[PDB]
Amino acid sequence: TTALVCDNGSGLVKAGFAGDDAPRAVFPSIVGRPRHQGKDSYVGDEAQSKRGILTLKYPIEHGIITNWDDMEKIWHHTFYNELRVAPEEHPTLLTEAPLNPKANREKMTQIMFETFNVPAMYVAIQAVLSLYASGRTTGIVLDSGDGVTHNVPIYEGYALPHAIMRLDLAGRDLTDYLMKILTERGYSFVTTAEREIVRDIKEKLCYVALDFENEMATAASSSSLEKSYELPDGQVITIGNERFRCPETLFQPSFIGMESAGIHETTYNSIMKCDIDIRKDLYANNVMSGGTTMYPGIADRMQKEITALAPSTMKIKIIAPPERKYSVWIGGSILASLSTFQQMWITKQEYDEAGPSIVHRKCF
Amino acid sequence: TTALVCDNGSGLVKAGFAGDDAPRAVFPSIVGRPRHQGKDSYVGDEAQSKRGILTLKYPIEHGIITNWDDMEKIWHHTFYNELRVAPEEHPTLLTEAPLNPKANREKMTQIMFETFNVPAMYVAIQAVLSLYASGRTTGIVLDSGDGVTHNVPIYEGYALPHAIMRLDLAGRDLTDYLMKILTERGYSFVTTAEREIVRDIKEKLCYVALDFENEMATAASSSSLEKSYELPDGQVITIGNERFRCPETLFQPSFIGMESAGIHETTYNSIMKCDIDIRKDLYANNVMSGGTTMYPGIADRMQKEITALAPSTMKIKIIAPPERKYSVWIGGSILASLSTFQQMWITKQEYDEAGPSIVHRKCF
Amino acid sequence: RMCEPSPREQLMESIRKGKELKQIT
Amino acid sequence: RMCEPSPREQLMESIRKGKELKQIT
Ligand SMILES: Nc1ncnc2c1ncn2[C@@H]1O[C@H](COP(=O)(O)OP(=O)(O)OP(=O)(O)O)[C@@H](O)[C@H]1O
Ligand SMILES: Nc1ncnc2c1ncn2[C@@H]1O[C@H](COP(=O)(O)OP(=O)(O)OP(=O)(O)O)[C@@H](O)[C@H]1O
Ligand SMILES: [Ca+2]
Ligand SMILES: [Ca+2]
Ligand SMILES: [Cl-]
Ligand SMILES: [Cl-]
Ligand SMILES: [Cl-]
Ligand SMILES: [Cl-]
Structure with missing residues (x-):
């Protein structure tokens, strides 16, 4: 009877039950398949761990769904393996990126109603x-x-x-950037686990300098900003100004050859x-x-x-x-739990009579 | 499953089923009782026909309910004897006069839910x-x-x-006025049936003159405006300018000593x-x-x-x-039949939790 | 916006559209 | 007017009011 809330990010899928404080499942938005086949498929953490033998695919690019077959595999996985519930038994709230095309909104609606047979549905801007x-x-x-x-x-x-x-320009770009500057310092990160280490360094040691310029020199004349990072292998490394230089790209995209x-x-x-x-x-x-x-x-x-x-x-x-x-997820959890939202859901009945173009009409 | 529509007029009750072209029951808004008792009661046509032995009461004065015990008797009669349905089985739409006090709106709500046990209710301005x-x-x-x-x-x-x-100033005043001018012409109308004759003369022969003054003299110099009225006893009478003089009171209340x-x-x-x-x-x-x-x-x-x-x-x-x-009735019939109205009804559940003061909140 | 109006505006639109009422027999 | 607002405004009012979400265990 609880509604399901699924925030489909480009990098991470956040899923759970409306009313909950946080998403019960958070995992990579990836579908893995053995290199030339076209298990026949792996989703999330498993696809990630089997990187060496699979071809990983991201069905969401810059918040937009670009691979519907792969998106359906992620959705199927989310319901059945992560949340462990049959979708036909729950209203489902999905999120979408800002400026999502109308065709994409209708395709999502069609899949939810026709493929997963949801009883009620709603799509919200992240x-x-x-x-x-x-x-x-x-x-x-x-x-x-x-x-x-x-x-x-x-x-x-x-x-x-x-x-x-x-x-x-987002988190993926920042990880890649930290991976580049760290690599040029004499360190090597090319494997999955290594890339995951860089992402961990990024999420744990990185920060935004209040004054970049003054911060830079403070690392030039001192070791005050240097933190040591203990690798999984026990080996310890020192990360310096890369700490604030990597997120600086957000304020100066020029750092990544980005003219924006x-x-x-x-x-x-x-x-x-x-x-x-x-x-x-x-x-x-x-x-x-x-x-x-x-x-x-x-x-x-x-x-x-x-x-x-x-x-x-x-x-x-x-x-x-x-x-x-x-x-985004919490917002969906709140929205879908409100007594006032219960009339807002698109019903199966409504979809049956008006089709997927209802999603635009139903809007609020 | 059809909603009931009841327009409670000061003179006539109009009742029927939402979706219908017209009210199935139209009868006098009267409750009759033998003179000093305090059948113990008669409603509508029957109370009217037994005038000689009963004390007739109008629970609605100038569109406002002034006698709740008598109003409930009319309502009970309307459901059970006129419409011949149990109110607990139907949403009920009642009408009210403009500027109806909030206490009156809540009392009506309370009676419908607590006395007639209606499942859904709504009150509309006539x-x-x-x-x-x-x-x-x-x-x-x-x-x-x-x-x-x-x-x-x-x-x-x-x-x-x-x-x-x-x-x-309304129809009752016009009937009484025609009864006065007709009486001074040498005719006698004092009994129920006689008063009903005057009301019939009013509804059948009366008209509004486009130009009162010019119309008056046209009846002075001619018999062109005179119509003959065949009484129930076969005797025929002639009604002249009283035809247009009686409704003229609407434009000049002064004709009835009314300063308005x-x-x-x-x-x-x-x-x-x-x-x-x-x-x-x-x-x-x-x-x-x-x-x-x-x-x-x-x-x-x-x-x-x-x-x-x-x-x-x-x-x-x-x-x-x-x-x-x-x-008024037709308007209610239309309103209560609209697919769009189905969410507007006050439910028994809603009344149970918030009480009669819900009627003001629920408004639309 | 392709959004349907408020429930009350949907009601007003339907009042203006008018509905055929069943004949009395 | 003692009238409750539009269903959408009731939704907005409840979003601004905020709701306590259940702890995760
Ligand atoms: N504490 C942190 N500090 C810095 N970056 C972080 C932190 N936590 C997560 N990230 C980065 O956030 C990104 C994931 O955030 P998010 O789940 O909001 O994006 P998404 O929804 O999957 O992708 P998008 O919103 O672009 O469609 C990853 O790049 C991750 O490394
Ligand atoms: N054809 C007609 N011409 C003139 N008067 C008429 C005609 N038909 C009905 N009336 C008068 O209309 C009055 C009843 O109209 P209506 O049913 O609209 O009033 P009501 O709702 O009972 O009383 P109120 O609206 O003042 O509360 C009676 O006085 C009746 O004689
Ligand atoms: Ca996101
Ligand atoms: Ca009336
Ligand atoms: Cl620190
Ligand atoms: Cl709530
Ligand atoms: Cl004529
Ligand atoms: Cl309808």
Whole structure:
């Protein structure tokens, strides 16, 4: 009777039961298959561990579903193996990326109703769920995950599509970048486990410098910023300025040969695409969500950068929940548990009479 | 499974099943009891026919319920004897007069749920139902019944209470007036059947003169306006100018010693109490409802009178449906049959948890 | 927005559309 | 008006009110 909540990230799938504090299952959004076959398939952690012999595929690219066969395998796995429930017995809330095409929204709807035979269904924009998680209906969300970074201005519960900004730079790019600078220091990371070590170094030692320039030299004249990382093999290594240099890419994409404005400028740009009367509320409700916004110092650095771009008189406020790795999921969990949401679900009956194009009509 | 629709008029109760073209039962809103007892009671037609030995009571005065014990007897009669259905098996839609006190709305709710054990309930303003009958959500309704005449401006489905005007002159007053002028012509009407004859003369021979003054003299210099009325006893009588003089009271209450503006001025006054931006739409959607607006010539006379009060540039339009005797009822029948209304009913469950004060909250 | 209106606006739209009522017999 | 807001506004009000979610075990 509990609704299921599934947040399909480019890198990680977060799944669980509506009403729960956190996702019961969090695993890689990967489908693995032996190199030329076309077990015939592996999903998540298992596909990851069997990397050496499989061809891994990510059905979600920059938040958009690009491989429907593989997406269905992930969904099937999520219900049956992770949550261990039959989908036909539960309302299902799925999430989608901002600016998701209408064809993609209908295909998702069709699969859920026709393939998994769900009794009730709903699709929510990820950034909006993060906003709801923070207990707001108006604000601007910065959602930085593994595949994509979006800036989503939301007014009275509805995102403003004309102002949505997408930055195709996220956690995956940061891991690869740390892997490059670490590699040039004389270390070797090329295997799965090694790449996982770099990702672990990133999530544990990395931080956003309040002042990059001043921080850099502080590592030049001292060993004050150097931390030692004990490898799984016992061997210990020293990571220095790569600590703050890797996440800096968010503010200066140029560091990865990327010709794009940083997260601070994109947030301003987005706010500026909104109606004047709403801007003040947006500046005062800048919500951070996603694994990639977990860097210590990011909120303090965004507050400074936005303050510098906004009018002097403007009250800028950054909201960075400690649970933001799962803010999208939590938002869905809250939404699908509300007494008030129970009339919002698309029913099987409704789908049967109007078809998948109902998803757009049903919207709210 | 059909909802019941009951329009409780001061003079006539109109009852039937939602979806039906017209009320299946239309009978006097009277409760009769033998003079000093305090069958112990008679309702409707029977109470009327046993007039000589009973004390008749009208639990509805000028559209407002004033005797709850007697109202319950009418309701009980309506369900069990007229409609011949058990109320606990059907959603019930009841109507109420404009400006009905909140205590009266809650008492009605309490009786329906606690006494008749209805499974679902709703209370609608009579004038709004008449507007819906005409297929509109915006307009100004003139509802003239037996006990009261109201002018109700409605915008986007909601009446504007600050602009509602009540004129305590209606059909009962017109019958009594015709009974007086006919009596002074040398005829005698004092018994029930005689009074019923006058009411029949009123509903069959009376009309609204386009120009009272010019009409009067046309009856002075000719017998062109005189109609003969064949009494039940075979005896035939001649009714002359009383034909147009009796309904004229609507435009000039002074004729009954009443110091009040006529229906035309009250309509203008009401429109004038509304927001400017809405006035144009009101003038263009003047809807007539109730038995008392059935007089031939009334719409043509209202069009003329309103035209004279409104700005020269104003498009004035009077809507006088031929079925207006039952417009309130029909409006309820339509409303309660709409697929869209099915979520609007107050449930027994809702009443049980929140009590009768829910009626105000549930409103729409 | 391809969104259907408020339940109350759906009700208003249906009131304006009008419905055929069954003849009385 | 003592009227409860639109179903969508009731949803927004409840989102702003916030709900306690059950601990994970
Ligand atoms: N504490 C942390 N610090 C830095 N990065 C982190 C941290 N935790 C997780 N990440 C990075 O967050 C990313 C996953 O976050 P998230 O689950 O929000 O993205 P996703 O939804 O799978 O992908 P996307 O939102 O782009 O579609 C991974 O790159 C992960 O390494
Ligand atoms: N054809 C007609 N011409 C004139 N008067 C009529 C006609 N038909 C009915 N009436 C008068 O209409 C009155 C009943 O109309 P209606 O049923 O709309 O009033 P009601 O709802 O019982 O009383 P109220 O609306 O004041 O509370 C009676 O006075 C009746 O004589
Ligand atoms: Ca995400
Ligand atoms: Ca009436
Ligand atoms: Cl530290
Ligand atoms: Cl709840
Ligand atoms: Cl005639
Ligand atoms: Cl319908």
